[PDB]
Design a protein around this ligand. Structure first.
Ligand SMILES: CC(C)CCC[C@@H](C)[C@H]1CC[C@H]2[C@@H]3CC=C4C[C@@H](OC(=O)CCC(=O)O)CC[C@]4(C)[C@H]3CC[C@]12C
Ligand SMILES: CC(C)CCC[C@@H](C)[C@H]1CC[C@H]2[C@@H]3CC=C4C[C@@H](OC(=O)CCC(=O)O)CC[C@]4(C)[C@H]3CC[C@]12C
Ligand SMILES: CC(C)CCC[C@@H](C)[C@H]1CC[C@H]2[C@@H]3CC=C4C[C@@H](OC(=O)CCC(=O)O)CC[C@]4(C)[C@H]3CC[C@]12C
Ligand SMILES: CC(C)CCC[C@@H](C)[C@H]1CC[C@H]2[C@@H]3CC=C4C[C@@H](OC(=O)CCC(=O)O)CC[C@]4(C)[C@H]3CC[C@]12C
Ligand SMILES: O=C(O)[C@H](CCN1CC[C@H]1C(=O)O)NCC[C@H](O)C(=O)O
Ligand SMILES: O=C(O)[C@H](CCN1CC[C@H]1C(=O)O)NCC[C@H](O)C(=O)O
Ligand SMILES: [Fe+3]
Ligand SMILES: [Fe+3]
Lengths: 601, 601
């Protein structure tokens, strides 16, 4: 109630949200490769408030103690502010509504002349306010099921909680000193390792990140080992079945399926169209991946509904969904006003499957630490574009894809904060207040921050500094999506439906068999992540589990309490370097050297 | 007397000498990059005899115990056999006497038509027998002064002794178990690290060995860090002043002198002639390096002579030099018979400065673990070629350079064995018997091994498989050396004479000042090694001393007895991989990938 919600925290979150919005917005409008900055926000939240308390002590002013619960509140409030900058599709979808992006796509069916909208402070802020708080209300019922009931470990949320607890621990114990000193040795090593790596990533696909540890043939199949301590640290605190399932999905997809499907580059799909398109080999990637996720996701979401339905029949949960319905109606009557191309029942369907789609992403983030929310928006954009003809089809796909992405992406990114608050013993109700305040500030700061860049500079020029590549890429997705499911490659629906059932069978197979065999069943939607990202992420995850397996065998006692600290330090050290690395890209300081790997030419 | 000199050891050394001769001879005649295989010979000496003892035990035959002293004898006998293969100039100097190499050099003054000699079993064996045992006799007086008196640490000899002792230790102690287990963890890590590195050294100047850790500009100045555990391990057991002096010489030479001298590429020396030549910027490299070594070397050699002369005036050593004089006379009356181009007093001068030149190389190897003997032969080849005119000048330089190199190179390589025998408590007299037997076998096996390659295949063809590049490179040195000291670049003698005095001043400055200031004086001839090799070797040496400095501060007790074992494991692990790496090059299996570093082009 108090000592967590403060005025200095409100001020500190507003600044940290403002700079991080500027960093995210500038990176989004130049390269579109927005990095993860949640770990950095926790550190700057600590330094800013600790500096303020000590500075006032220097001047004689006395202040309240700055505790870990308050640090969690400030970090969560700040994260919610700048998440809207990249979750709102400011560089991908909302910028694709430009007349400039409309002209770049060219003349084609679907791209009718009335498919452009210009940015403005008035409608972009009003667009965000109605839609952004929809994700927050769904978090209240999901918080109990996922964070504590399913015991999902959010590796980034767990690492941030251990980082924050270390900042504020003041007790001298036999283990507390060993936890901090072990954390600091690997935090500095991970930070310096990431700092050293930066000087050699000075080109397209070159550096320690693109390291062909098993050869160049395997590397082209995304079966290498990048020297990423984030994924190695993530795998250390993930259960072995999650890591093995991740490797199993990489072998099935990139080792078997994609070479086999690619053998029909002229028969099943056209060979002139580039890959990464919905028409050539990426329709398989995107639709099979979601079917695996939705196949597992639908089984689980029904199970909570079924368990709850039986419980009520035998006899604050409905408070949240009542509030969600109120915000649902607000968007239904408001979004079509801004976009005459968007019909009212499009929003209703978007807000009905949003609890469904948000649950799967939060469950997926709680397993593999990978937020897939922007992948859901691509599917929703494609589907909603096919739900309208050549008229009002591109705008409908872009706008409806933005709603689905925000509801899905916000839910997963902000459950990482509830895992952090769970470990820091922070009050959930004070967490939700920080949710709304940060979201409210984000829905205001981000549109004005975007417009200051937009009015001053020239964003969207293919030949220029401020080029937003994903504005046109998302625009071309909607143009392609105007044509219905016919443009998908041959047998794309059939195989996706098969993997939908295959994911559902594994989910049943794990809950019906005894626990003495249930622990060997792979998780279908941990398998699905390596369908879009390569197998390098899977290999890093399995290396971390290999480290923990060996460590547990060598010393059972020490590995019990030291693995989380070492894993968090690896995640935080790579996470903290993302802030100086972003400032370097902010000032256009490129790496000097490129570490290229060649076939002994 | 016994239990060290055995018949199975004689057999085992003969085989190990024979294969290693074949490996060295094939590598010398194809690339000329003969690697160090002394560490590998110790392991194969252990496995061959241990396998023999266990196999006879399997068949019921009983045999004498195989001890560490016998393992030292077998390794030393084997090393002496195959050292003659590359110390004898079979691919550099003796092969440069060919009519084929004579024709490749072309028509020029100095390259008179009578400057070729053809290989044969008769003269090549007789050439080796007279000259090879000259180096062995000089070892007896140098053994006391360098190994035990000056307390010089031979890092490769020390590492081999620790490797051999670990093989034969059978006592369970509080520390013996920790020494072996610590050694094995870093031996396997170093071996696998070198094995992993091999797949990416698949090109000219690319791999972890050519890693620009401080940038591409510093790398071209040879101021990078190669990931070599041999030099890192060598620096761990070398005193800090040796490592700091090595870094100081690299900064003075490659950081100051060579950029400054290179600013006169048209005024001081011609710009059309390539570098690495005695006429362009390598006359500075070679002559300043020897002057630093000879400046320090002459001060020391006089000091032993002065101390001994005073000791005798106040009142087996002369046994060795009496035998050396007898072998000296044998070569004086025999070498001019084979080579009418070589005069009798050329051999006398070569055999008089040989105790001098051998002492400096053994002292240098006892500090930095770098054998410079083949660098002495280049200087001796150049000087002796200028001591004869256009007539009989190229052959005189090549032959006399071969004598000087063998006397110098054998002395340094075989003092590494006396350090090994010192730590293994091996009898010096049994060591010297293994010296002669291995040398006698080497003087026979190597000429026949060479001729089998020579008769069967075509060695010396610039466009072919068996190309011996250094046969022509050494031939061109003698042709250039026919012209006297005039061809050396401008001010080469003046600067070399200055560094000769500067090296002598530091040697005096260290013996006359009190020990409380004498320990900060740099060693002039540890400084001289980075004049020819780059500063990457110096940086690796200093990193090893940095590791020991930190380890000593953190834990004084453990670093006392664990540093030699960890350092030896790093040296041995990289050393052992040299055997499989040579077999791969033996079968022409090239690395698949090249790790190239580019300026972000
Ligand atoms: C004991 C543990 C630490 C094992 C270490 C991992 C090995 C199983 C890996 C490390 C290096 C890998 C090799 C690295 C490089 C290649 C090159 C690759 O050849 C290429 O395709 C290169 C490009 C070309 O030559 O066209 C074939 C596989 C291979 C031998 C890899 C096979 C698997 C290796 C030996
Ligand atoms: C133990 C942990 C730390 C991970 C170690 C895994 C690797 C040692 C292995 C396991 C899976 C293997 C991959 C499994 C499947 C393939 C598919 C295969 O792909 C193709 O058939 C090529 C298709 C084409 O020709 O385009 C090539 C080998 C590769 C990459 C293998 C390379 C080596 C991998 C990554
Ligand atoms: C705390 C310890 C571990 C310090 C780590 C060593 C640093 C002092 C080194 C590591 C990386 C080095 C950098 C690596 C690469 C370059 C590129 C180099 O630029 C080039 O010349 C590249 C080629 C080109 O761009 O033309 C300038 C020096 C610099 C910044 C190096 C400066 C020194 C650095 C920062
Ligand atoms: C602490 C231990 C482990 C070694 C670390 C040493 C490096 C951090 C420093 C010390 C010496 C430095 C070098 C000292 C001298 C030079 C000479 C200088 O050479 C030139 O002036 C270029 C000449 C030309 O233009 O051709 C460039 C910097 C460089 C390579 C420096 C690069 C960085 C080095 C290797
Ligand atoms: O969204 C995308 O597909 C790409 C790459 C993936 N983004 C980066 C972070 C991730 C996401 O949206 O969660 N970003 C485009 C520009 C900006 O990220 C935006 O979405 O407005
Ligand atoms: O001698 C040389 O300058 C070169 C490179 C340096 N060698 C390799 C080992 C070192 C040496 O001679 O101690 N080797 C040429 C062929 C053969 O090594 C030989 O000398 O016959
Ligand atoms: Fe994005
Ligand atoms: Fe050589």
């Amino acid at each position: 109630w108090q000592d967590e919600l403060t005025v200095r925290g409100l001020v500190a979150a507003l600044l940290i949200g403002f700079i991080y919005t500027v960093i995210v917005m500038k990176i989004a409008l130049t390269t579109g490769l927005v990095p993860t900055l949640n770990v950095s926000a926790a550190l700057l939240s600590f330094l800013a408030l600790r500096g303020w308390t000590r500075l006032l002590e220097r001047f004689g002013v006395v202040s309240r103690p700055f505790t870990r619960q308050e640090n969690t509140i400030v970090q969560t409030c700040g994260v919610a502010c700048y998440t809207i900058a990249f979750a709102g599709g400011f560089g991908s979808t909302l910028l694709g509504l430009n007349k400039k992006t409309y002209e770049l796509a060219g003349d084609s069916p679907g791209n009718v002349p009335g498919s452009w909208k210009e940015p403005g402070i008035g409608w972009m802020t009003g667009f965000l306010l109605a839609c952004s708080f929809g994700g927050l209300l769904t978090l209240i019922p999901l918080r109990q099921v996922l964070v504590v009931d399913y015991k999902l470990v959010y590796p980034s949320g767990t690492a941030t909680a251990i980082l924050i607890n270390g900042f504020h621990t003041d007790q001298g114990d036999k283990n507390s000193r060993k936890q901090i000193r072990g954390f600091l040795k690997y935090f500095g090593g991970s930070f310096l390792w990431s700092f050293f790596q930066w000087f050699y990533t000075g080109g397209d696909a070159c550096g320690f990140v693109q390291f062909p540890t098993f050869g160049l043939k395997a590397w082209k199949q995304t079966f290498y080992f990048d020297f990423s301590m984030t994924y190695v640290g993530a795998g250390m605190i993930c259960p072995h079945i999650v890591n093995i399932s991740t490797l199993l999905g990489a072998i099935i997809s990139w080792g078997i399926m994609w070479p086999l499907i690619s053998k029909n580059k002229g028969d099943w799909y056209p060979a002139k169209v580039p890959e990464s398109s919905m028409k050539s080999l990426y329709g398989y990637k995107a639709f099979i991946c979601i079917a695996l996720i939705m196949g597992d996701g639908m089984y689980h979401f029904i199970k909570i509904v079924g368990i709850t339905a039986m419980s009520m029949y035998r006899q604050p949960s409905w408070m949240a969904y009542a509030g969600y319905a109120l915000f649902s109606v607000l968007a239904v009557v408001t979004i079509p006003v801004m976009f005459k191309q968007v019909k009212w029942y499009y929003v209703v369907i978007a807000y009905v499957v949003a609890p469904m789609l948000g649950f799967a992403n939060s469950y997926g983030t709680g397993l593999t630490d990978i937020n897939m929310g922007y992948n859901y928006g691509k599917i929703a954009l494609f589907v909603f574009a096919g739900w309208a003809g050549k008229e009002n089809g591109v705008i409908a796909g872009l706008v409806a894809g933005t709603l689905v992405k925000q509801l899905v992406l916000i839910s997963a990114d902000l459950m990482q904060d509830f895992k952090t608050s769970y470990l820091t013993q922070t009050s959930p109700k004070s967490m939700m207040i920080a949710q709304v305040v940060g979201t409210a500030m984000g829905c205001i700061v981000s549109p004005l921050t975007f417009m200051l860049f937009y009015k001053a500079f020239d964003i969207g020029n293919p030949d220029g500094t401020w080029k937003a590549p994903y504005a046109l890429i998302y625009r071309n997705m909607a143009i392609l999506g105007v044509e219905g499911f016919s443009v998908l490659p041959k047998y794309c629906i059939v195989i996706s439906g098969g993997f939908f059932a295959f994911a559902a069978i594994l989910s049943i197979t794990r809950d019906v068999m005894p626990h003495k065999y249930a622990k060997y069943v792979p998780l279908p939607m941990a398998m699905a992540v390596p369908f879009l990202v390569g197998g390098s992420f899977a290999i890093d995850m399995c290396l971390g589990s290999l480290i923990v397996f060996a460590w547990t065998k060598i010393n059972k006692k020490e590995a019990g309490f030291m693995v989380p600290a070492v894993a968090s330090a690896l995640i935080c050290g790579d996470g903290i370097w993302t802030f100086p690395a972003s400032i370097l890209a902010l000032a256009k300081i490129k790496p000097p050297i490129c570490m290229k790997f060649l076939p002994a030419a």
